[PDB]
Design an enzyme around this catalytic site. Structure first.
Site, PDB file in Angstrom:
ATOM      1  N   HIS A  90       0.800  -1.216   0.000  1.00  0.00           N
ATOM      2  CA  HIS A  90       0.000   0.000   0.000  1.00  0.00           C
ATOM      3  C   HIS A  90       0.837   1.272   0.000  1.00  0.00           C
ATOM      4  O   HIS A  90       0.285   2.355  -0.206  1.00  0.00           O
ATOM      5  CB  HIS A  90      -0.940   0.017   1.208  1.00  0.00           C
ATOM      6  N   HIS A 135      -7.350  -6.809   0.326  1.00  0.00           N
ATOM      7  CA  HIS A 135      -7.313  -5.441  -0.158  1.00  0.00           C
ATOM      8  C   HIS A 135      -6.687  -5.395  -1.547  1.00  0.00           C
ATOM      9  O   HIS A 135      -5.999  -6.321  -1.979  1.00  0.00           O
ATOM     10  CB  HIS A 135      -6.539  -4.545   0.808  1.00  0.00           C
ATOM     11  N   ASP A 145      -1.805 -10.950  -6.491  1.00  0.00           N
ATOM     12  CA  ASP A 145      -2.182 -10.436  -5.182  1.00  0.00           C
ATOM     13  C   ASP A 145      -3.486 -11.089  -4.745  1.00  0.00           C
ATOM     14  O   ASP A 145      -4.533 -10.883  -5.376  1.00  0.00           O
ATOM     15  CB  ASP A 145      -2.324  -8.915  -5.223  1.00  0.00           C
ATOM     16  N   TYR A 182      -2.618  -4.625 -19.168  1.00  0.00           N
ATOM     17  CA  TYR A 182      -1.581  -5.298 -18.394  1.00  0.00           C
ATOM     18  C   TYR A 182      -1.806  -5.123 -16.895  1.00  0.00           C
ATOM     19  O   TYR A 182      -0.863  -5.092 -16.107  1.00  0.00           O
ATOM     20  CB  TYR A 182      -0.198  -4.794 -18.792  1.00  0.00           C
TER      21      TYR A 182
HETATM   22 CA   LIG Z   1      -5.760  -8.272  -3.580  1.00  0.00          CA
HETATM   23 CA   LIG Z   2       1.284  -3.289 -15.874  1.00  0.00          CA
HETATM   24 ZN   LIG Z   3      -5.115  -6.595   3.257  1.00  0.00          ZN
END
Ligand SMILES: [Ca+2]
Ligand SMILES: [Ca+2]
Ligand SMILES: [Zn+2]
Ligand SMILES: [Zn+2]
Ligand SMILES: [Zn+2]
Lengths: 368, 126, 536
Positions: A135, A172, A168, A216
């Site tokens: 973050h 979040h 990811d 992308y």
């Molecule tokens: Ca995520």
């Molecule tokens: Ca990218």
């Molecule tokens: Zn998180």
């Protein structure tokens, strides 16, 4: 087959105190390590002590002013930096505590050393649970993160790998990493996250990149109470399509554990097995992989999840019974490795997931 | 309400010094019903969102692409014209509103609109 | 020509409103002013006519600073980008420089009462409480180890060099903060003097600091043992209740959802939706049932019948003749309707009360089946887990609680039925019943939380099903018509008997001309029975 992996742990990381009542607790890493010691997983793994990252290494992405502020600020001189403290978003949500710069140095150095190791082809798997702070911005602190070590690790990986894929699975949206590489085609960021009146408030279905980096960057927004079956049904095909279109050379996997059931801040309904299914799917493709930590605010569940994924990456099977360890009483009253979900309603209906998956597939078909 | 926090913080202390398209109150589908524009189903299957410009109800999943969360403010259904006006994003909302109100005083215009439709409809131009 | 008039006629009929129709007219008029191309015109008209392929085909034949995404803004061109010293070539060519995203919310938001049960917050508080004490203890212990190591190093060198040994602000450790933090916590305001003594004269100052730290460590360890004793049996009292997110909502929602008016509304709304669809003329056949339910086991059927009979036999207000009548209704007539006594169907015409009874009976049977399936899954998972964990070398591949035996796992379901019987009799408290159910079936236990009331409801229906002449006339008409074979029969013979079936429906209309009439079809297939209900 069975392959050699590198583990990064510094004994001092567990002592850094974020403040009273703050959801972020580095102590989790310590417990995770303890569990790894009591399953006998240190014998099949190589453990390193991460070198501290110099501010020159951090200024490859962050400004020198922000890093100088981070290196200078202390709890006993908060009065002489108030304006700066307002400017860099250091304050209530991301407090200034004792030795925060050393914490950032250790967390960044672990992932940077792992990336260097993968570049040198001395291993095809590096693990750093202290990392995963996604973050943080170029000149500000956000979401309990001060220094974005994922961006620095990818910048280190880019010196030998033409295309780097970042995944990811933290609940979040990883806005820092996605924004760092928004206009480039050498890094594609896949993010699965909750959307709608939720931090950080970004990562829409239509955020697909800009300029040369168009198509992308893919975001899957979700609703409350996604469970193992839905996550497995939509993670494997999307990742397979991404790997077939993009054809990356290295993978960076953010394994944030705040997407498990019972999390202090999360809303999802995953379990440890469903969480680590993503690690198995990623490992199937046989690429240089860097696994990082991230979120997770129910400390015992974080320990369980990360020890299970560390076992999975080693191709090792561990018993469901937790061995006796220093933090055993945390895991009552069952003292099991795996956790049970709740019966909260899954608001992600099948038609919603099918529509989002189809839109993502049509976005992916446009790559060259 | 006995929590152990006070005792722990004292034990570790340093020495220091001295409306109509919703379920009823009891929970029931109101009758007569209004249905989604895409599936023709009421609020029983899923909550309905009402467009504030036209009386068209919609389902969060019946849209394309589907909405992830409830729209907190004023929401625009996909069955209006301002979307093509939104293709050019440079101009502000006042000019768009004045352009719309240019046709807001003769709203029927039925004869002239059918006339223009047939006038364009001729395959060979005049 | 008239074809255009017919097209416009059907479109304003199908749009069912004037505002949407006028929006369509605005679209076609904007096209007529030469501001819209043909392909753009059809892509704009697609929202209005995307669900009528015939209308769409007919219309096609008739025709023959910048911002991107939703959360990224362009940075100012005349903005002094903050300089960076480490930027290499890849840094310049790869890193984003023009677009920024603004975080709209903050973590640790107002989520305390958003979705969490009250028994998750106790667990969170206990966990925090544990963490604060543990982190202080481990900082103290790490400092103790560091000082022990430096003392061991000091004791091994020459005495003329010991007074020349000094320490920095890391105090022998690898961190410049942690050791000083521990000493500060131990000594309060006198910390700087002790720190200066340790840095300047380590030989004389280290052992006394070590002794103080060790004493504090022992006292804190015993206090933590007591606190560990207290913290237990709070996890035990909170864990299973923290995972059950629906019981509090489910009890009231189910106590309402079973009222006769709610059941009637659930089918009236579907009837109204289908009527509106017929009014708009959409392509939907006029023979589909409004509601469909599945019975997947006969054993569940006799179990439910046994439960209802058990409750009704202990009724003071139901007379022996009525007990016998309900027995015939429940164990003889209903199985005959479900054909317990492929492509074989049964037809039944029912009033409101029989519809209510069928709905309640289906609900009870579905819940019993759900509990049974959960018990089978639990037993299978336990056996598989035992087999897997027996064959485990663990790390060679380079107290607690006693789980129940397999016998208890396979006897869970009969124990569950006995528990339901006990609750119905009133011999067991609802609280103990709920706790035992939760400990037996974990997060699927709530399905059985309000069973007794359900049974009670069913009982009432049965009783009324004897006292109202309409209901007995209905069952007698069904029996008389089935004696002719028109009501229900083989699937193929439908067109053979269809007209006769019509007569039956006619009679229904003349027996309940002031009451709702329900057509119920029981279709048997592959061991299951599909009950389809439609309102006439
Ligand atoms: Ca995520
Ligand atoms: Ca990218
Ligand atoms: Zn998180
Ligand atoms: Zn709909
Ligand atoms: Zn509208």
């Amino acid at each position: 087959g069975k392959k050699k992996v590198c583990y990064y742990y510094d004994g001092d990381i567990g002592n850094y105190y974020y403040g009273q009542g703050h959801p972020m607790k580095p102590h989790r890493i310590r417990m995770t390590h303890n569990l790894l010691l009591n399953y006998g997983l240190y014998r099949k793994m190589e453990i390193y002590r991460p070198h501290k990252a110099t501010a020159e290494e951090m200024t490859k992405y962050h400004s020198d002013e922000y890093i100088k502020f981070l290196r200078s600020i202390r709890p006993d001189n908060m009065s002489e930096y108030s304006k700066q403290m307002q400017r860099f978003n250091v304050g209530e949500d991301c407090p200034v505590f004792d030795g925060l710069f050393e914490f950032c140095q250790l967390s960044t150095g672990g992932s940077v050393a792992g990336a260097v190791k993968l570049n040198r082809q001395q291993t095809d798997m590096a693990v750093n649970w202290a990392g995963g702070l996604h973050h943080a911005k170029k000149s500000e602190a956000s979401g309990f993160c001060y220094v974005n070590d994922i961006v620095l690790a990818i910048l280190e990986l880019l010196k030998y790998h033409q295309r780097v894929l970042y995944i990811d699975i933290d609940i979040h949206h990883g806005d820092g990493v996605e924004e760092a590489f928004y206009t480039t085609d050498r890094v594609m960021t896949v993010s699965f996250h909750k959307y709608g009146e939720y931090f950080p408030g970004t990562g829409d279905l239509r955020d697909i990149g800009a300029g040369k980096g168009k198509y992308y960057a893919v975001n899957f927004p979700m609703r409350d109470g996604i469970d193992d079956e839905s996550y497995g049904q939509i993670f494997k095909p999307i990742i397979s399509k991404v790997m077939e279109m993009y054809q990356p050379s290295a993978v960076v996997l953010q394994c944030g554990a705040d997407s498990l059931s019972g999390d202090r801040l999360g809303c999802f309904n995953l379990t440890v097995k469903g969480h680590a299914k993503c690690v198995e799917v990623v490992k199937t493709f046989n690429l240089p992989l860097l696994m990082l930590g991230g979120g997770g605010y129910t400390i015992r569940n974080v320990a369980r999840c990360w020890t299970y994924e560390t076992a999975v990456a080693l191709d090792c099977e561990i018993p469901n019974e937790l061995p006796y360890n220093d933090y055993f009483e945390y895991f009552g009253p069952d003292f099991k490795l795996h956790i049970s979900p709740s019966n909260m309603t899954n608001q992600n209906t099948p038609e919603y997931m099918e529509k989002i998956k189809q839109r993502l597939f049509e976005n992916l078909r446009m790559l060259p | 309400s006995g929590g152990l926090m006070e005792q722990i913080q004292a034990l570790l202390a340093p020495p220091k010094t001295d409306t109509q398209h919703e379920l009823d109150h009891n929970g029931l589908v109101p009758l007569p019903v209004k249905v989604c524009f895409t599936c023709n189903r009421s609020c029983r299957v899923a909550p309905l969102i009402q467009c504030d410009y036209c009386p068209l109800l919609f389902h969060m999943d019946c849209l394309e692409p589907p909405l992830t969360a409830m729209p907190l403010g004023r929401w625009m259904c996909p069955n209006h014209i301002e979307h093509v006006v939104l293709n050019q994003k440079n101009m502000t909302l006042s000019n768009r509103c004045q352009v719309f109100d240019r046709f807001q005083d003769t709203v029927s215009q039925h004869v002239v609109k059918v006339d223009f439709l047939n006038r364009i409809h001729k395959k060979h131009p005049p | 020509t008239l074809q255009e008039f017919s097209f416009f006629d059907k479109v304003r009929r199908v749009l069912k409103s004037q505002e949407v129709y006028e929006n369509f007219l605005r679209c076609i008029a904007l096209f007529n002013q030469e501001l819209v191309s043909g392909s753009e015109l059809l892509q704009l008209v697609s929202p209005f006519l995307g669900k009528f392929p015939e209308l769409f085909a007919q219309f096609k034949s008739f025709l023959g600073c910048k911002r991107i995404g939703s959360s990224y803004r362009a940075l100012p061109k005349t903005y002094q980008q903050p300089k960076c010293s480490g930027r290499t070539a890849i840094c310049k060519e790869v890193l984003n420089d023009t677009w920024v995203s603004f975080p709209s919310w903050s973590e640790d938001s107002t989520f305390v009462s958003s979705k969490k049960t009250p028994y998750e917050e106790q667990l969170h508080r206990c966990e925090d409480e544990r963490f604060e004490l543990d982190v202080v203890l481990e900082t103290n212990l790490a400092t103790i180890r560091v000082l022990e190591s430096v003392q061991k190093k000091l004791s091994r060198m020459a005495p003329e060099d010991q007074e020349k040994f000094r320490l920095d602000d890391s105090l022998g450790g690898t961190s410049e903060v942690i050791q000083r933090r521990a000493i500060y916590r131990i000594y309060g305001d006198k910390a700087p003097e002790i720190i200066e003594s340790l840095k300047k004269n380590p030989v004389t100052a280290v052992p006394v600091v070590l002794k103080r730290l060790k004493a504090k460590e022992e006292e804190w360890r015993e206090a933590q043992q007591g606190f560990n004793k207290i913290w237990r049996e709070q996890y035990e009292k909170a864990y299973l209740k923290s995972l059950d997110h629906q019981a509090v909502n489910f009890k009231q929602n189910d106590t309402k959802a079973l009222r006769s008016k709610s059941l009637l509304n659930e089918i009236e709304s579907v009837y109204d939706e289908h009527q509106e669809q017929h009014s708009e003329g959409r392509s939907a056949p006029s023979s589909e049932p409004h509601l469909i339910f599945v019975y997947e086991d006969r054993q569940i059927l006799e179990d439910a019948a046994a439960l209802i009979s058990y409750y009704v036999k202990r009724q003071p207000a139901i007379q022996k003749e009525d007990q016998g009548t309900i027995h015939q209704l429940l164990h003889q007539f209903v199985p005959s309707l479900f054909f317990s006594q492929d492509d074989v169907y049964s037809l039944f015409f029912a009033n409101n009360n029989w519809y209510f009874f069928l709905r309640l009976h289906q609900t009870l049977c579905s819940r019993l089946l759900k509990i049974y399936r959960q018990a089978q899954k639990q037993l299978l998972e336990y056996r598989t887990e035992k087999e897997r964990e027996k064959l485990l070398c663990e790390g060679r591949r380079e107290l607690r609680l006693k789980q129940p035996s397999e016998v208890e796992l396979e006897e869970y379901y009969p124990a569950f039925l006995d528990m339901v019987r006990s609750l119905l009799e009133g011999s067991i408290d609802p609280t103990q019943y709920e706790d035992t159910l939760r400990e037996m079936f974990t997060i699927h236990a709530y399905v059985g939380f309000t069973m007794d009331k359900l049974v009670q409801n069913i009982a009432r229906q049965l009783h009324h099903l004897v006292s109202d002449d309409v209901c007995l006339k209905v069952v007698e008409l069904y029996l008389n018509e089935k004696k002719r074979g028109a009501a229900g029969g083989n699937l193929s013979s439908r067109c053979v008997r269809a007209a006769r079936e019509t007569s039956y429906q006619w009679k229904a209309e003349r027996c309940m001309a002031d009451e709702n009439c329900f057509k119920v079809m029981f279709l048997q297939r592959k061991g299951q029975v599909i009950m389809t209900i439609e309102l006439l």
